[PDB]
Amino acid sequence: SLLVKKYCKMTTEEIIRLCNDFELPREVAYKIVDEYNINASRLVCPWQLVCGLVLNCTFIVFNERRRKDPRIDHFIVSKMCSLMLTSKVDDVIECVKLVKELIIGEKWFRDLQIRYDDFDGIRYDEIIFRKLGSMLQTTNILVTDDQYNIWKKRIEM
DNA sequence: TACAGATTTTATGTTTAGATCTTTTATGCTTGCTTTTCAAA
């Protein structure tokens, strides 16, 4: 496993290669890199921070494709369990929920969540009614309209 | 206007809620000293 390794010498190009393995554009990848540099030391296992940062941005950037296909989540989790050479899927979840606590308040994470409309996996137009306690909020009980149209196309083909 | 009755005035007692002030005791900072685990050789 790469999450047990302590005090590793990370070049600046390995993080860009790991970000390009998850199709992150240049701004978010450079922000992950800069987030690594300002906490370069004070670090125990760099791979845990980089892995949590990359997957935390991955669920934000690709949140449109994660609502349509729930398999994408397992798929990306497994690519990660791989690039970290680990067979335990709870270590990756521990990594992302430990990195989320260090990134939940910054300005750039705020800009990313605003621009891709992520807000812990929710649109703003739903989360304002979850926070208000609306009776008329959208319930995850009925199928999505576009998902139902996609299924109707799948049975038409 | 006289008057019985009802209410007000003056006067005091009973009980609870809270304020203030003092005295003794907990506690938080200072500073110097000893032990201990964690980020490099």
CA of A5 to C1' of B40 (A): 15
- The total of other beta-carbon atoms located within 10 Å of residue A112's CB is 19
CA of A42 to C1' of B32 (A): 30
Q: Which residues contact A17 (CB under 8 A, 6 or more apart)?
A: none
Q: Which residues contact A71 (CB under 8 A, 6 or more apart)?
A: none
Report the alpha-carbon distance of residue A4 to residue A86 in Å, rounded.
10
- The total of other beta-carbon atoms located within 10 Å of residue A64's CB is 10
Report the alpha-carbon distance of residue A2 to residue A113 in Å, rounded.
28
Q: Are A45 and A4 in contact (CB under 8 A)?
A: yes
Q: What angle do CA A141, A97, A93 make, to 5 degrees?
A: 75
Nucleic acid strand B: bases within 7 A of protein CB: 39-40
Report the alpha-carbon distance of residue A95 to residue A92 in Å, rounded.
5
Query: Closest nt to A7 (CA→C1')?
Result: B39
Q: Are A61 and A28 in contact (CB under 8 A)?
A: yes
Packed helices A107-116 and A26-38: angle between N→C axes, nearest 10 degrees: 160
Tokens of A34: 């800069």
Q: What 3-state class would DSSP assign to A73?
A: helix
Alpha helices in A84-156 (DSSP H): 89-103, 107-116, 124-132, 145-156
Give me the residue label for tokens 């799948």: A154
Identify each DSSP E strand in chain A by its residue range: none
Largest CA distance in chain A: 57
Query: Closest nt to A42 (CA→C1')?
Result: B39
Of A43, A52, A58, the closest CA to residue A10 belongs to A43
Output residues with Cβ under 7 Å from nucleic strand B. Answer: A 6-7, 41, 44
Q: What angle do CA A3, A58, A9 make, to 5 degrees?
A: 35
Which H or E element spans position A4? none
Q: Are A98 and A52 in contact (CB under 8 A)?
A: yes
Give the burial string for A140-149 (b: 16+ CB within 10 Å, else e): eeeeeeeeee
CA of A62 to C1' of B18 (A): 63
CA of A13 to C1' of B18 (A): 71
